[PDB]
Protein backbone atom coordinates (compact mmCIF):
# COMPACT_ATOMS: atom_id res chain seq x y z
CA UNK A 1 0.00 0.00 0.00
CA UNK A 2 1.22 3.49 -0.86
CA UNK A 3 -0.78 5.37 1.78
CA UNK A 4 1.13 3.40 4.42
CA UNK A 5 4.39 4.44 2.75
CA UNK A 6 3.33 8.10 2.84
CA UNK A 7 2.33 7.86 6.51
CA UNK A 8 5.64 6.20 7.39
CA UNK A 9 7.53 8.90 5.48
CA UNK A 10 5.61 11.60 7.37
CA UNK A 11 6.44 9.93 10.69
CA UNK A 12 10.11 9.67 9.71
CA UNK A 13 10.20 13.35 8.72
CA UNK A 14 8.60 14.18 12.07
CA UNK A 15 10.95 12.11 14.25
CA UNK A 16 14.54 11.50 13.07
CA UNK A 17 16.51 8.34 13.82
CA UNK A 18 19.60 9.90 15.38
CA UNK A 19 17.21 11.76 17.66
CA UNK A 20 15.68 8.42 18.67
CA UNK A 21 18.97 6.67 19.43
CA UNK A 22 20.28 9.71 21.32
CA UNK A 23 17.20 9.83 23.54
CA UNK A 24 17.46 6.06 24.00
CA UNK A 25 21.07 6.40 25.18
CA UNK A 26 20.65 8.18 28.52
CA UNK A 27 21.85 5.37 30.83
CA UNK A 28 19.48 6.08 33.72
CA UNK A 29 20.93 5.74 37.20
CA UNK A 30 20.27 2.51 39.12
CA UNK A 31 20.36 2.95 42.94
CA UNK A 32 19.11 3.03 49.58
CA UNK A 33 16.03 3.54 47.39
CA UNK A 34 15.26 6.42 45.04
CA UNK A 35 12.19 8.07 43.50
CA UNK A 36 10.36 6.58 40.51
CA UNK A 37 8.82 9.96 39.59
CA UNK A 38 11.73 11.00 37.34
CA UNK A 39 13.38 9.58 34.23
Amino acid sequence: KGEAIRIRSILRSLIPLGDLVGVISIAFQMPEPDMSAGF
Partner: protein
Amino acid sequence: ANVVVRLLIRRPECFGPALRGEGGNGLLAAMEEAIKIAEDPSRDGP
Protein backbone atom coordinates in the same frame (compact mmCIF):
# COMPACT_ATOMS: atom_id res chain seq x y z
CA ALA B 1 -4.42 6.04 12.59
CA ASN B 2 -4.68 7.78 9.21
CA VAL B 3 -7.20 10.35 10.41
CA VAL B 4 -5.32 11.09 13.65
CA VAL B 5 -2.10 11.54 11.66
CA ARG B 6 -3.96 13.89 9.31
CA LEU B 7 -5.26 15.97 12.22
CA LEU B 8 -1.88 16.06 13.98
CA ILE B 9 -0.05 17.19 10.85
CA ARG B 10 -2.70 19.79 10.00
CA ARG B 11 -2.42 21.20 13.54
CA PRO B 12 1.34 21.36 14.22
CA GLU B 13 1.06 22.88 17.71
CA CYS B 14 -0.16 19.58 19.17
CA PHE B 15 3.46 18.43 19.41
CA GLY B 16 5.89 19.81 21.95
CA PRO B 17 7.30 23.27 21.30
CA ALA B 18 10.86 22.03 21.86
CA LEU B 19 10.31 19.26 19.28
CA ARG B 20 8.16 20.87 16.57
CA GLY B 21 8.42 24.43 15.31
CA GLU B 22 11.01 27.04 14.42
CA GLY B 23 12.19 27.13 18.04
CA GLY B 24 13.54 24.08 19.86
CA ASN B 25 15.85 21.78 17.92
CA GLY B 26 14.25 18.41 18.55
CA LEU B 27 13.37 15.58 20.88
CA LEU B 28 16.97 15.21 22.09
CA ALA B 29 17.36 18.77 23.36
CA ALA B 30 13.75 18.69 24.57
CA MET B 31 14.33 15.70 26.84
CA GLU B 32 17.73 16.98 27.99
CA GLU B 33 16.09 20.26 29.02
CA ALA B 34 13.38 18.21 30.74
CA ILE B 35 15.99 16.24 32.70
CA LYS B 36 17.76 19.49 33.62
CA ILE B 37 14.47 20.96 34.87
CA ALA B 38 13.76 17.80 36.86
CA GLU B 39 17.21 18.01 38.45
CA ASP B 40 16.94 21.74 39.23
CA PRO B 41 14.10 22.22 41.77
CA SER B 42 13.86 25.95 40.95
CA ARG B 43 11.41 25.18 38.12
CA ASP B 44 8.65 23.41 40.06
CA GLY B 45 5.72 24.18 42.35
CA PRO B 46 6.74 24.93 45.96
